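A reminder before we start the practical. When you read a complex entry, don't treat the lines as separate problems. The point of joint prediction is that each chain is placed relative to the others, so the output describes one connected object in space. Small molecules and nucleic acid strands, if listed, are placed in the same frame. In the example below there are five entries. Take a minute to note the order of the lines before looking further.
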Amino acid sequence: NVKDLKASQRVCLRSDSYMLHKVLENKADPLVSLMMVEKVPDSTYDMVGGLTKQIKEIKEVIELPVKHPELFESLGIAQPKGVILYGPPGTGKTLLARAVAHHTDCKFIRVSGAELVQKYIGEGSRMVRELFVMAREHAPSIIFMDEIDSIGSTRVEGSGGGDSEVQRTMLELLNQLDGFETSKNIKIIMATNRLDILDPAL
Amino acid sequence: FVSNSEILKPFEKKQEEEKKQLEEIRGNPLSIGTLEEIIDDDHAIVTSPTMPDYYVSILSFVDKELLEPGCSVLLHHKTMSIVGVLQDDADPMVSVMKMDKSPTESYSDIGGLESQIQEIKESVELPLTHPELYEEMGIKPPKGVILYGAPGTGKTLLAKAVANQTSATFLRIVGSELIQKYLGDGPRLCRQIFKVAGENAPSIVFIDEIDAIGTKRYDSNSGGEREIQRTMLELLNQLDGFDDRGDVKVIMATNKIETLDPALIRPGRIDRKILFENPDLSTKKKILGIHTSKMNLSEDVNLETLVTTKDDLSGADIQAMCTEAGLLALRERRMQVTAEDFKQAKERVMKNKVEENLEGLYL
Amino acid sequence: APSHLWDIMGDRQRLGEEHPLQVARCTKIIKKYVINLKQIAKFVVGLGERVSPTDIEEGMRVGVDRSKYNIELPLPPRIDPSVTMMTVEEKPDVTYSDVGGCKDQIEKLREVVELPLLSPERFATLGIDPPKGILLYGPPGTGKTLCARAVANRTDATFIRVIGSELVQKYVGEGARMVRELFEMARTKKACIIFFDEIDAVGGARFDDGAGGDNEVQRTMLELITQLDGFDPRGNIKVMFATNRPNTLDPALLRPGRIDRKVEFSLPDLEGRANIFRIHSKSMSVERGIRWELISRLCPNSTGAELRSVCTEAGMFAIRARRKVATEKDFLKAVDKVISGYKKFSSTSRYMQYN
Amino acid sequence: LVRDAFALAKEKAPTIIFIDELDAIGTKRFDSEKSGDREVQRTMLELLNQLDGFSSDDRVKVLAATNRVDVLDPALLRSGRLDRKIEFPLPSEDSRAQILQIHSRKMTTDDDINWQELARSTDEFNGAQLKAVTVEAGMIALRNGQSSVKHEDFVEGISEVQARKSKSVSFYA
Amino acid sequence: AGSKNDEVLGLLLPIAASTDLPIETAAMASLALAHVFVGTCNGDITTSIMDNFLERTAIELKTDWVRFLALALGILYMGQGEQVDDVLETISAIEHPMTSAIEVLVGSCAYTGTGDVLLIQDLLHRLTLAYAVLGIALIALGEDIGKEMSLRHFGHLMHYGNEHIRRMVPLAMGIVSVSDPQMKVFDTLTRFSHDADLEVSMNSIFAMGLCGAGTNNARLAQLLRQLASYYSREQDALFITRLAQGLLHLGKGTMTMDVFNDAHVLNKVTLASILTTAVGLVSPSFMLKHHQLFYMLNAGIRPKFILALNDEGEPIKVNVRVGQPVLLNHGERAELETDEYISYTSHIEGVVILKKNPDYREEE
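Here is the predicted structure of the whole assembly.
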């Protein structure tokens, strides 16, 4: 019947009679162009040394309301939107984002702002915010931002790095969660180098 | 008895004979394609996803009004004739569109802005809720409003309460997403924005935080300065040259609208210019009570005490202290937040969190 | 119900082996017709049964049978573009009398457009050439687009409104095809009107240095000028150029022979702004005995878009001020509101003369 | 399109291919990061190579007409392609009198109009601006109801807005 | 209409017995006597009407004047109650096809306001005549549940093979929609606007003026202008299309005709207009008729207004915010809204009295 059939399902279509036979498999986890799906990573707190002082800062702030949503709801405050790190690159700031996703039992997903803009019919600007839907069907998201700025590899060290368009757009999408769904399961993890790289609105 | 023989009997006989024809009409494969153009002779051309080309006759289960260039129809296997038109369900194109139904907001949380609310409510909510006022009088309501003021006044929550009371479609267009990498997609995006909003209901069009073209800042997206005009003038032609009776309401707001081209603002269509400033000590007392209404406060905490300490702060700076004070007590895990947490929270917001510049000062 | 009547012909118009036709275009005609398919395949056939030898023309879409290729029915050419099918509007809401004022800028447009269409034999006596193009720019906010929709009402024919950002497409070279899409319907549909909105984003003469990509925009005009004034002087209908930036336009585009009548909107004077409030006095609610000549006099020279905002806001004072109908007291408040209150940006009012 | 044009030009006789509005071809410069190019340059290379090696001998002749020479390919002009440099200066006094009179051959007048007098009223006007004078002269007789175009119609047509004309109750004293 | 006079027994009563309908098209006073007695019947008036159906000769076989006499008995016996059964038994004595149209009308007027399964099935059996379909929408007015559900029963009436039933479908839609316009009603009238039969399209035009009662144009702006293509196709489409257009603007757009109010009281004067003008609107409509049949709508016009007085009629200003007016005072109209002061009795629109307490008193 049609009860067992849904969107994005690999099936077998007969030839002579041109009819459905059976269902083969489902759709793979990676979608569209580039989709990074990592569930339950191997990074833990024991793998990160010397940052224990900073681990308590990413626990009671980031990790705490994710495991206990009834805390900020009872205190009358709002769940924090996102937390950004300030430090030199290559020091393992990305490792801290992958380690907290393991203890929270979430799916680590990056954001590459370079490939978010494509050209199709109706999908042209959809690819930018398409990562928002990927964090809807799966609540344990903890979105992480990649391709921040120029560390001295590419050119254009000044002006913008292209992240100001994606970062400020994803943070604005959080208002629909509390306004319509009345629940925010999405959190944006950001990072940078200096203080003045960010826009004054952030 | 008498009516059932002249109604139910001929109806059930025609339905059973119609289902027998559906086997010969609709085949097993039921190929589809893209409709290009239609002719008054009941003949059209359809292109399948394999890009073939055919010329057939228009059959039943469709009319001349349902056929539009660029749609998808149903074809036949051997004869390749058009069986009928296939409507498009589950949104027209994109499923992440900001369109929602009855969000959660009220007028109690936006309190204190009523001086600026009366202007936007009459030009947006009033014609949608009470259309008999503008229609019977003969005046035409404005096609949109624009907001300006200092950052932190909470201009986002002003239009958020409109979507709940109007109970209609509410759309949001980010000002930073207006441009596109590929040249020519800028106007193609803006054309589809007003196309969806024009088909279903007057609804709402809300644009916030426009950085577009302002002081560059995007070196990963190159328009060559020619895409600047084509993308911006597309929004201008839809607010002027596009034929509309006043249903579409387009709202634009950001930190500074003075850097934008005033021709793009299209004066005379927007009759409401609302300014926002920093609230005084009397308004902050009402705003502070809103964020602390759902918060558990101790007996020694006084609302009038924290307002006196606040100096040169906007509406967003007040909520920041209430959120930070909740996080300070969250580390100690206290049910009621004591007064020592508010003292340390109000100092850290105005220092590390909020950086107060000189700007125009001259003391 | 209507499907039952069409099922009788289903034994003929459906099961027939004719209708499954393959559409293609004939590249070469020998009087043997070389016809190129959509699959990149060609063949050579002759005429059909009911096919006339004079119906097949060079460069025309000709459908053929799918199995054994043979010419059956001709088809109109240029079947690919789907974009220009939506550019033609029908019955604009703005009428001919909606433009406020007796200003002679109205009389100049009707004689160069509406007159040759309604009375083509009037100028044929003197043996003259009616102006092919017109010029309407003006400052933003004077109701220029209202005059464009006012002519389409009296014309009672096909009207085409082209967006300045519509011509430039997402590929390089497709904009040249967009120009031929407009002028092809001029021969197909006679006695129509084409209109261009915001031609500045189209118009060329952007020179070269320092951008490196400005040559993509100027190629649209080079195709637009060629399709307008070419080698063969091909033209029928009237062409309308409209933009808010006359300074950035191609100085060759402003030269005559592609444009004859040049009409630039100005600021209505005390007598000009008087009729603006009189045409709006028939709407809304006006108290008996109110003289609108004093209201337009207190308001300084400004665009027509800000004049209609006065009457719109005048009816909005009765809500807050607890009034029945709009009085003279509420009209004076609109002068300090619509004009004096909005003086901070959000307006043109002769802001941009050039750029 | 360029290769197939000259390929038939040998069998189709010296058709004298005419190319108009050359401003689209001949730009080169260089490409760094943005401002994508070279898609148009490939069309120019066919125009340069076809007119050099395999053609341009006897029956191959090409006439080119552009607007401004400020932007073009300096290598496009060569003794094998474009030889003579032809300039079209603004018509003189006696030159404008002949041009303006020919556009009136299809009109109806009393032959009392002095065209040499109208040539002096026209100061540095191109061939396109001269044609607009006869067009405006016919529109004046329609409003005034004149059965024939007289001399004052051409003089008033100059005062009407065509080029470098404004008026509209503007007096500087 | 609405008046009661006993002097009509010596003037219009003997004229209606002259049997001038089939011959001279005269003695139409039966329609005039219906407006005299409202809610009550009469022995001499009813007897003079049954005398026309008693002879049933060849001259009286014309179907044009049949329903003219039925509207007389339908208004007199409207809301009669359980006493309608005794009248139907007397009419059932004479057997003629004319008696079928009388029972479906007069019988439906007494039960108006209450839905019944047996009454609806009896009206559907007479279709295989004009007021048999309108009787379903008439009795469904009193029930708000059956009023909205009656739309689905109207669309099912197109299953018949005769086009005379389909053209009568939109006439029933205007009776239930006369109060407030609905979105689902507009989509149904669109299909009847385009048809090969002219009688189907003309009947749908008159239904648009009834459904849009209370306003000028909302969704009817593009629907009434879509009929401009029918002016060149039919000469009679000039008057019929513009006739219903004026009903929306009737009374400068403020006045309207509705059988509902804040007290839920069905007015028989309005029912004596729309029901009489629905069948036989113009001469080409239905069979051959005259142009004088649609003038009954002027007697049922009920304007909307709100006013306040004190004792002798001294004007007192209130505060009511409605459409133009916003914050009115004296001499304006309002709908479904009251003021912030304390009224006397009605507590609704119209002419009321204000009585203020010594505690909180706010006046001009």
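Discuss with your neighbour: The two ends of chain D are 60 Å apart (CA to CA). What might explain this?
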